[PDB]
């Protein structure tokens, strides 16, 4: 409306910067300014500007911005050249596209290396240097580097530095047929970082707020953010630097350099009211300084305060690292490119991937799969391919119904993207629901092959926990945070059970146990078929089939030990090869 005001930005940035701005707007000229800080607004702004609804101006690095002229949901902008001339003109380049300029250059974002100096005289200015520093400070009680190990934004300068890239520009243009992320240089840099959690440097789980919270406790020696990031370390007491990040193989790190734009409402009628608060009140000393007293923004577009800050050596240094690095492309086939590379670092940290076969489906994604939807539903496709697979596999068991819920939950979460639409399910939670699906996926893996040699209870806690996590999976009550705890309570429970007794020689045989000779009683009737049948003459097939007989007659069986089992199996892999004369 023409009353109020509502600004989409980041819950990263300044924002309780720009509520002072807000006051000292409504204060000044009878329009209040209250600035919120919604979550996924970056993906929201489509299905909410195809409804003519939004926030009066949206914030975000002018990566996506550009995508929102594929769909026309920024408006034009315009001002004049004493104004044109009072910000940096490569800047007004960020927002151009297809001539009409969609946004405002705010400022200049750049991830740069942050490290202590407490503990560290120099840091590694060469990536190779750092595993040799971690298992040093493997012993003085701290670690040696931990930052966002989720967003694929962080990853990209390692990635970068032998030479993987996004879209190779050309003659004017991106060649979206040449993207370089499975390049030679990309498998570098993802190998390299795959190594160092590997080695107990890092760990694949580091989120945003976690190592956040790890530089700044000070367990950890380094950490690398944009400027957004050194408010909450003004605001803890960590003595550290500001570098250029590492050289990984003698060439410098490379960080995708992010305009933070200002963009405008596709069909707002306050355009008037929004390209006023933007250029006077903000995007001058007396805004600049409050967004910057409150999140920096590194090097501010406005010549007069980055003029200011510029002595500032934390920015010398983002800058020395954003010169080193490539500003963005704004395409809107940026959006698919990232979320292909996201995917990847998640799983080769992890491990579900290794880092060839990952980078080719990021690779193969990014030059046409341009559906940030389409990509989720391939990774369901291959869980419910293996979800299937591993039903017939381990059935009649305490995890079918674990199973075959998820496999109905993997067709559930498909559709509510696809020609469904209603979504029962929130859009915040869709990721952490399809990802969790991967852990359940990895419990039910984790399960079969290490509690089958255990007292059924073993087995019993898992499968309703399993059970549990794909309910909370379901359940549109549940929220992020509500699956994510649910998530750790499955991996909690699989250290549990592990305490159990194994099972005794004496013991009525679990249905697991008789999974075991009843897998041999299928190797054995496929072994006899293909080298037996007709291949050896019939006397020694009929004193064959007899020990199948016989191996079956253990396992109806009910009250077979453990040990009438282990000495039945015995039989067979020496009556199967009584029958190989
Ligand atoms: O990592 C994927 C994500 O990266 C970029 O987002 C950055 C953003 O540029 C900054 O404003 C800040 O919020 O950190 C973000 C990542 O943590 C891209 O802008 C975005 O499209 C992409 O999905």
Redesign the pocket.
């Known amino acids: 409306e023409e009353g109020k005001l509502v600004i989409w930005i980041?819950g990263?940035?300044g924002y309780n910067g720009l509520a002072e701005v807000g006051k000292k707007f409504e204060k000044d000229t009878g329009i209040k300014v209250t600035v919120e800080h919604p979550d996924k607004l970056?993906e929201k702004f489509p299905q909410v500007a195809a409804t003519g609804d939004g926030p009066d101006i949206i914030f975000?690095?002018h990566?996506?911005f550009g995508g929102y002229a594929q769909s026309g949901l920024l408006a034009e902008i315009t001002p004049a050249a004493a104004f044109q001339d009072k910000l940096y003109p490569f800047t007004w380049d960020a927002v151009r596209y297809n001539g009409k300029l969609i946004a405002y250059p705010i400022a200049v974002?750049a991830l740069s290396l942050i490290y202590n100096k407490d503990l560290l005289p120099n840091p590694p200015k060469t990536w190779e240097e750092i595993p040799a520093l971690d298992k040093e400070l493997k012993a003085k009680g701290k670690s040696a580097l931990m930052f966002?190990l989720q967003?694929?934004?962080?990853t990209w300068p390692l990635i970068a530095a032998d030479g993987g890239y996004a879209f190779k520009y050309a003659a004017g243009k991106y060649d979206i047929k040449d993207v370089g992320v499975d390049n030679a240089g990309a498998k570098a840099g993802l190998t390299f970082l795959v190594d160092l959690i590997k080695n107990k440097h890092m760990n694949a789980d580091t989120d945003?707020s976690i190592a956040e919270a790890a530089f700044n406790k000070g367990e950890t020696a380094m950490t690398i953010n944009?400027p957004?990031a050194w408010s909450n370390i003004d605001t803890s007491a960590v003595n550290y630097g500001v570098t250029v990040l590492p050289t990984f193989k003698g060439q410098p790190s490379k960080p995708?350099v992010?305009v933070?734009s200002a963009g405008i409402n596709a069909a707002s009628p306050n355009k008037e009211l929004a390209k006023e608060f933007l250029e006077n009140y903000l995007l001058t000393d007396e805004g600049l300084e409050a967004v910057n007293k409150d999140k920096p923004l590194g090097a501010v577009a406005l010549k007069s305060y980055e003029e200011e800050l510029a002595k500032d050596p934390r920015i010398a240094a983002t800058m020395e690292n954003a010169q080193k690095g490539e500003i963005?492309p704004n395409i809107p086939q940026?959006?698919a490119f990232?979320?292909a590379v996201?995917t990847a670092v998640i799983n080769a940290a992890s491990g579900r991937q290794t880092v060839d076969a990952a980078l080719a489906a990021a690779q193969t994604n990014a030059v046409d799969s341009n559906n940030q939807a389409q990509q989720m539903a391939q990774k369901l496709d291959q869980d419910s391919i293996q979800l299937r697979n591993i039903k017939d596999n381990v059935q009649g068991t305490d995890y079918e119904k674990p199973v075959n819920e998820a496999i109905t939950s993997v067709e559930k979460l498909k559709t509510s993207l696809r020609a469904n639409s209603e979504t029962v399910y929130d859009l915040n939670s869709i990721g952490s629901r399809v990802e969790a699906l991967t852990d359940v996926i990895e419990a039910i893996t984790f399960s079969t092959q290490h509690l089958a040699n255990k007292v059924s209870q073993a087995n019993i806690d898992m499968g309703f926990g399993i059970t549990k996590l794909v309910i909370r999976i379901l359940d549109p009550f549940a929220s992020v945070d509500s699956i994510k705890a649910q998530v750790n309570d499955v991996k909690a429970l699989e250290q549990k059970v592990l305490t159990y007794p194994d099972l005794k020689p004496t013991d009525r045989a679990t249905i697991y146990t008789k999974s075991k000779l009843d897998k041999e009683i299928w190797n054995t009737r496929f072994t006899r078929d293909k080298k037996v049948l007709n291949v050896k003459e019939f006397k020694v097939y009929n004193t064959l089939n007899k020990a199948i007989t016989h191996a079956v007659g253990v396992q109806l069986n009910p009250n077979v030990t453990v040990q009438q089992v282990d000495q039945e199996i015995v039989t067979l892999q020496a009556a199967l090869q009584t029958a190989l004369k």
């Open positions: 980041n990263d940035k970056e975000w690095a990566d996506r974002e966002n967003e694929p934004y962080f945003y944009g957004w995708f992010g933070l963005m940026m959006s990232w979320y996201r």
